[PDB]
Amino acid sequence: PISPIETVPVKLKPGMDGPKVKQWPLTEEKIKALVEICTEMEKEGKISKIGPENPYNTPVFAIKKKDSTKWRKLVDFRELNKRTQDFWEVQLGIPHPAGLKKKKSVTVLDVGDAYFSVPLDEDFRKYTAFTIPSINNETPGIRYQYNVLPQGWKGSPAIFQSSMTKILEPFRKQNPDIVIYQYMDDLYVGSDLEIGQHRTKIEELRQHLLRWGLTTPDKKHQKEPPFLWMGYELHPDKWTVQPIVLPEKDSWTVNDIQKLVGKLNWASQIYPGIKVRQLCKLLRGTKALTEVIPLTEEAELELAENREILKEPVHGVYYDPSKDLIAEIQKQGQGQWTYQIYQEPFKNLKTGKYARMRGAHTNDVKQLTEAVQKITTESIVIWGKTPKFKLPIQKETWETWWTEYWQATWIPEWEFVNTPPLVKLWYQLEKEPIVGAETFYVDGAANRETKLGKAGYVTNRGRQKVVTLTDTTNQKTELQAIYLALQDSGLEVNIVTDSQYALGIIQAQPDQSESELVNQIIEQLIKKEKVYLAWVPAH
Amino acid sequence: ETVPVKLKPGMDGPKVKQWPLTEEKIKALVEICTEMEKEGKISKIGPENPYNTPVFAIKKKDSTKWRKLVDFRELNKRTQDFGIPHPAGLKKKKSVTVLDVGDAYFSVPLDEDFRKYTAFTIPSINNETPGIRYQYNVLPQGWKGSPAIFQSSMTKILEPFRKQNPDIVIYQYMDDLYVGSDLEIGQHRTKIEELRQHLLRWGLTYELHPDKWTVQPIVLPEKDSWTVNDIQKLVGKLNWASQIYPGIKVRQLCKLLRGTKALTEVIPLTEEAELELAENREILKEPVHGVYYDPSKDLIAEIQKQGQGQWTYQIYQEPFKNLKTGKYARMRGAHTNDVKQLTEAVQKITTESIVIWGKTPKFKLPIQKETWETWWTEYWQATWIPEWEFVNTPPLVKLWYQLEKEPIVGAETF
Ligand SMILES: COC(=O)[C@@H]1CS[C@]2(c3ccccc3)c3ccccc3C(=O)N12
């Protein structure tokens, strides 16, 4: 009942050798149980009884199930594995509903024994030997080695998928109209043929596989649409988001809050209306996971709002290669971005949110370019295409910014969509000195060790100032200088500084940063009607 | 017959990941590969092979067809060593032409044991299908062991054209052949055809002018009247420049800045202060002494975006000791695509670089890794790929080099 499938050449890691771990002792109950399960496998050709001619071993653990609650079998190959060659990384990236195309009908075959069905490389079998213990470790144990892909073995997933692919090859060509997806033990089949035809084609596949050993279970195990695909319910002509339930408890532990926020966060993608601020202030100063933190009123609130939100149903449409692929983005708050990708207005294939990007120093447009790139990459992955962007920024602003930004940046084909708030340049340093406006020669200095300093200015007009600072830094005294010049000056100002950090501001003009200082400066910059900032060598 | 080929000691084959590709590029690659498979150049492989190397589809002018491009960079580095001392005279021809002799490789089989390491992957949309895994059976374009193992064959095929035309240099690099002669624009092209035609009777099928390349100097401004700001900016530029020309001095000039006057306030240039500037200009009339290309050190290419489609770059191995420097203006059709301009500029520098020291420079790119990795390939046209790192352009570097001189009027190209 094995197979006529060619085996894959498997080799041990470079210079390593097979495992040699003594067998764990088990009860008389667990022994007859394994002697059971196993005595079966030997017949089905899955395993072959071997003698002390094999220096290798792997521990076997007998544990019951919940289905028949009878003793099952478990083999720990953890050792053999880390002694087993590296294979080709198996599909870790799965399909996404938004990239699927509508089908007339979809099925799903469960190639359960997918593993014990595919033969193991004849030479490698020797290493997959395990020993069935004896009562009281008395007489010797019964040796066994796998002939098939062992469940839990490193090579098993990749070697089964391969075999599966080779097996499906002919069927794939004998009829393109039928799209097939292998996922672990599952084969998901879809087509745009009428149900009668499809069902028949399914049957054909089933018997074709059976022509290679691989069999499909009965009517009891069979799965029927819609399918639960990573948070989604897949209907052949539509996807619906699987409703997520938020527990209704009276005492929340830290673990509980952290697992709640996680859920909330993922939901945030499909539902951009979700909030978690108030649930996130609860983890403050927490001393232990099992700690019980009482939900504040605010936490009790948003937790509620989210429930009703998560009530609303969210369904979707599949990808029509024939229509436009569009992607619209919204700036939902400094560094917070929302995007919905669609084809038919108001009919999303996919929505999403990017965490609040918060780095050392950027501006809202560069952040927009980043949101835009990520969506591009996701899109290329999901549809092998790049959506047409609808962005809340004016072609003018875009043009002004990038054409002159120090860094190469880009936004694929895109169109302006006037949906407030639009992203804009919060300010623009003058290109040239401002005639008329006051000139603040600023300078801050501090003993980096004592952390004492002075930040001040002397204008050409006569105005001057100096403030002593404690527990500061040179960077901060310098920035404190520029900051004072900004407060004490009118709507137009010229500031000359030797601050190297200034120079960075001049070339990147950040409208947000990690330091509250630069932040203050930025707020001041945003207020002025004109600001010319100039650098000069220090000392 | 195949020559034995190994990796460097203790160096394992590349296990690099395949970037996602557009539908059109996948469709094209699948086509290109089914045929190479048909033609016995590559073969499908199993899960036992853990290796992988990036691939994509490019498309140079005069083509509706797509070319497959494998990024053997990682592999090339791990590939054992084995080329020519480079024709120092190449950098002198009135006009050089590049040739893609990449196909002259599938003829030669690849040592059976090295095949695994050439494993590549044709990605699938939405992960709906696992990759179509392959590996080469022949010498692959883009691999460095190829031009080597096929050297002699290339030697024998070129001589006849070489002797008939000794006033024409034939330098090879990767899948490329650079032909440079001093014949007139027409008498030169007709010669390429003769070399190609000659090359044509086998399995092989860019026009630059090295002697035109001139390392331009730095030109300090000469305002009508100078303001405080004017000087402050000049001093900074000059002061930073000190690092390259230790003779450049800002002493006097800096003394005209000992006043808290308006930035727009005009300042009179003292006689001494003008001498100082005069001398700095002198010092800046020629490339610094002592710069010698070391073939035992990596060639470094750094670029800065000067905005408005303009780019500047320096090729060097030591800091501030430039072997070459230049300004690059974007090409027609790229007004709104920094990435395109960048890859173009990057390809030019490489090309110039190849011509001069016969090897590619490690590049320093003023672009974000994500932005580059997502779109460079969409405008790549060369058969080779240089090494690169992404960096933040320092404010002064850009300010100092946008300073270089440009044509009096242009090129007067009637
Ligand atoms: C990707 O195309 C396929 O191979 C398969 C075939 S079945 C599946 C599918 C099932 C499970 C996971 C992923 C897809 C599907 C279901 C619902 C609507 C369309 C499709 C489709 O084309 N998919």
Q: Which residues line ligand 1 (CB under 6 A)?
A: A 95, 100-101, 103, 106, 179-181, 188-190, 227, 229, 234, 236; B 128
In a domain, B412, yes or no: no
Residue of the CA atom closest to atom 9 of ligand 1: A188
- Compute, in angstroms, the gap from residue A321 CA to the centroid of ligand 1: 15
Q: CA–CA separation, B51 vs A476, rounded Å? A: 50
Cβ contacts of A84 within 8 Å, gap of 6 or more: A10, A12, A13, A153, A154, A155
In a domain, B282, yes or no: yes
**3-state DSSP helix/strand/coil % of chain B, to nearest 5:** 35, 20, 45
- According to DSSP, residue B363 is labeled E
Task: Report yes or no: A538 at the B interface, CB cutoff 8 Å.
Answer: no
Residues B318 and B189 in one domain: no
User: By three-state DSSP, how is residue A18 classified?
Assistant: coil
**Do B63 and B27 touch, CB atoms closer than 8 A?**
no
* Closest listed residue to residue B45, CA positions, set B104, B123, B165, B131: B131
In a domain, B407, yes or no: no
DSSP B199-243: HHTTT---EE-GGG-----B-----SS-BHHHHHHHHHHHHHHTT
CA terminus-to-terminus distance, chain A: 86
DSSP A74-115: EE--HHHHTTB---PPP--S---GGG----SEEEEEE-TTHH
Q: CA–CA separation, B294 vs B351, rounded Å? A: 19
User: By three-state DSSP, how is residue B185 classified?
Assistant: helix
How far does CA B382 lie from the centroid of its chain?
Answer: 9
Read off the tokens for B363: 């590049």
Ligand 1 atom at shortest distance from the alpha carbon of A237: 18
Q: CA–CA separation, A277 vs A264, rounded Å? A: 11
Residues B126 and B200 in one domain: no
Residue of the CA atom closest to atom 13 of ligand 1: A95
Helices (H), B358-390: 369-375
* Closest listed residue to residue A273, CA positions, set A297, A233, A308, A242: A308
Residue of the CA atom closest to atom 18 of ligand 1: A236
**Do A494 and A439 touch, CB atoms closer than 8 A?**
yes
Select from A87, A93, A373 the Cβ nearest to the Cβ of B47. A87
Residues B1 and B142 in one domain: yes
In a domain, B162, yes or no: yes
Residues B115 and B183 in one domain: no
In a domain, B27, yes or no: yes
Sign of the alpha-carbon dihedral angle for A54, A56, A57, A58: negative
**Do A121 and A8 touch, CB atoms closer than 8 A?**
yes
Q: CA–CA separation, B369 vs B374, rounded Å? A: 8
- Compute, in angstroms, the gap from residue A86 CA to the centroid of ligand 1: 29
Kind of pairing, strands A530-535 and A492-497? Answer: parallel
For chain B, counts of helices (H) and of strands (E): 11, 14
CA terminus-to-terminus distance, chain B: 55
Closest residue of chain B to A462, computed from CA coordinates = B260
What CA–CA distances, in Å, run from B251 to A263, B247, B270? 65, 11, 12
Is the peptide bond between A25 and the residue preceding it cis, with omega within 30 degrees of 0?
no
Task: Report yes or no: A158 at the B interface, CB cutoff 8 Å.
Answer: yes
Q: CA–CA separation, B199 vs B208, rounded Å? A: 21
Sheet arrangement for strand B168-173: B168-173, B176-181, B95-100, B207-208
This PDB structure is determined at a resolution in Å of 2.5
Task: Report yes or no: A414 at the B interface, CB cutoff 8 Å.
Answer: no
In the stretch 417-436 of chain A, residues with CB closer than 8 A to chain B read: 432-435
- According to DSSP, residue B91 is labeled G
Residues B174 and B190 in one domain: yes
Select from B227, B339, B396 the Cβ nearest to the Cβ of A408. B339
What is the count of residue pairs from A and B with beta carbons less than 8 Å apart? 171
User: By three-state DSSP, how is residue A11 classified?
Assistant: coil
Is there a contact between B263 and A434 if contact means CB atoms under 8 Å apart? Answer: yes
Select from B48, B236, B341 the Cβ nearest to the Cβ of A537. B236
Is there a contact between A181 and B128 if contact means CB atoms under 8 Å apart? Answer: yes
Residues B304 and B386 in one domain: yes
**Do A394 and A402 touch, CB atoms closer than 8 A?**
no
**Do A74 and A151 touch, CB atoms closer than 8 A?**
no
Cβ contacts of A117 within 8 Å, gap of 6 or more: A2, A3, A111, A148, A149, A160, A213, A214, A215
Read off the tokens for B169: 């240099």
In a domain, B179, yes or no: yes
Read off the tokens for B188: 């030169």
How far does CA B1 lie from the centroid of its chain?
Answer: 34
State the angle between helix axes of A516-527 and A474-487 in degrees (0 to 180), rounded to the nearest 10: 20
Residue of the CA atom closest to atom 11 of ligand 1: A188
Write down the residue that tokens 């010797």 correspond to. A140
Q: How many CB atoms lie within 10 A of CB B331?
A: 13
Q: Which of B182, B207, B232 is the last residue of a domain?
A: B207
Amino acid making up residue A282: L
In a domain, B410, yes or no: no
CA angle B148, B149, B153 (to 5 degrees): 95
Task: Report yes or no: A193 at the B interface, CB cutoff 8 Å.
Answer: no
> What H or E segment, with its residue span, contains residue B389?
strand B388-390
State the angle between helix axes of A297-309 and A254-270 in degrees (0 to 180), rounded to the nearest 10: 40
How far does CA A112 lie from the centroid of its chain?
Answer: 28
Read off the tokens for A237: 């002509």
Q: What's the CATH number where B20 sits? A: 3.10.10.10
Is there a contact between A535 and B236 if contact means CB atoms under 8 Å apart? Answer: yes
Q: CA–CA separation, A25 vs A132, rounded Å? A: 9
**Do B136 and B45 touch, CB atoms closer than 8 A?**
no
Residues B229 and B158 in one domain: no
Residue B59, domain extent: 1-85+106-146
Q: Which of B293, B317, B335 is the last residue of a domain?
A: B293
DSSP β-bridge partners for residue A12: A84
Is there a contact between A9 and B48 if contact means CB atoms under 8 Å apart? Answer: yes
Select from B126, B339, B375 the Cβ nearest to the Cβ of A96. B126
Residues B142 and B200 in one domain: no
Residues of A in contact with B337 (CB under 8 A): 410
Is there a contact between A11 and B371 if contact means CB atoms under 8 Å apart? Answer: no
- According to DSSP, residue B34 is labeled H
Residues B141 and B2 in one domain: yes
Q: What's the CATH number where B278 sits? A: 3.30.70.270
Is there a contact between A410 and B240 if contact means CB atoms under 8 Å apart? Answer: no
In a domain, B281, yes or no: yes
Assign 3-class secondary structure to A273-307: CCCCCCCCCCCCCCCCCCCECCCCHHHHHHHHHHH
Is the peptide bond between A345 and the residue preceding it cis, with omega within 30 degrees of 0?
no
Report, in angstroms and rounded to the nearest whole number, the Rg of chain B calculated over CA atoms: 25
> What H or E segment, with its residue span, contains residue B342?
helix B338-357
Q: CA–CA separation, B256 vs B244, rounded Å? A: 24
Residues B133 and B4 in one domain: yes
DSSP β-bridge partners for residue A512: A362
* Closest listed residue to residue A380, CA positions, set A357, A355, A412, A402: A412
Distance from CA of B114 to the nearest CA of A (A): 17
Residues B3 and B141 in one domain: yes
Read off the tokens for A259: 């697992």
**Do A240 and A259 touch, CB atoms closer than 8 A?**
no
State the angle between helix axes of A516-527 and A500-508 in degrees (0 to 180), rounded to the nearest 10: 50
Helices (H), B117-207: 145-149, 151-164, 185-200
**Do B127 and B156 touch, CB atoms closer than 8 A?**
no
Q: CA–CA separation, A535 vs B394, rounded Å? A: 13
User: By three-state DSSP, how is residue A421 classified?
Assistant: coil
Read off the tokens for B396: 């002064």
**Do B394 and A406 touch, CB atoms closer than 8 A?**
no
Residues B38 and B140 in one domain: yes
Domain count, chain B: 4
> What H or E segment, with its residue span, contains residue B252?
helix B251-255
Cβ contacts of B123 within 8 Å, gap of 6 or more: B18, B20, B21, B26, B131
- Compute, in angstroms, the gap from residue A162 CA to the centroid of ligand 1: 19
Read off the tokens for B308: 């408005």
User: By three-state DSSP, how is residue A62 classified?
Assistant: coil
DSSP β-bridge partners for residue B388: B363
Q: How many CB atoms lie within 10 A of CB B192?
A: 18
Amino acid making up residue A78: R
- Compute, in angstroms, the gap from residue B239 CA to the centroid of ligand 1: 65
| From A105, A181, A189, A319, mutation site for ligand 1 pocket: most ligand atoms within 8 A of C-beta | A181
| From A94, A96, A103, mutation site for ligand 1 pocket: most ligand atoms within 8 A of C-beta | A103
> What H or E segment, with its residue span, contains residue A343?
strand A336-344
Cβ contacts of A391 within 8 Å, gap of 6 or more: A328, A329, A368, A372, A411, A414, A415, A416, A417, A423
Q: CA–CA separation, B87 vs B158, rounded Å? A: 15
What CA–CA distances, in Å, run from A476 to A444, A511, B394? 8, 18, 21
Distance from CA of A200 to the nearest CA of B (A): 23
Q: Which of B207, B233, B254 is the last residue of a domain?
A: B207
> HSE of A316 in the Cβ direction (CA atoms, 13 Å)?
26
Q: How many CB atoms lie within 10 A of CB A124?
A: 23
Ligand 1 atom at shortest distance from the alpha carbon of B126: 1
Could you tell me the domains of chain A? 1-90+116-156 (3.10.10.10), 91-115+157-225 (3.30.70.270), 226-319 (3.30.70.270), 320-426 (3.30.70.270), 427-538 (3.30.420.10)
- According to DSSP, residue A334 is labeled T
DSSP β-bridge partners for residue B327: B312
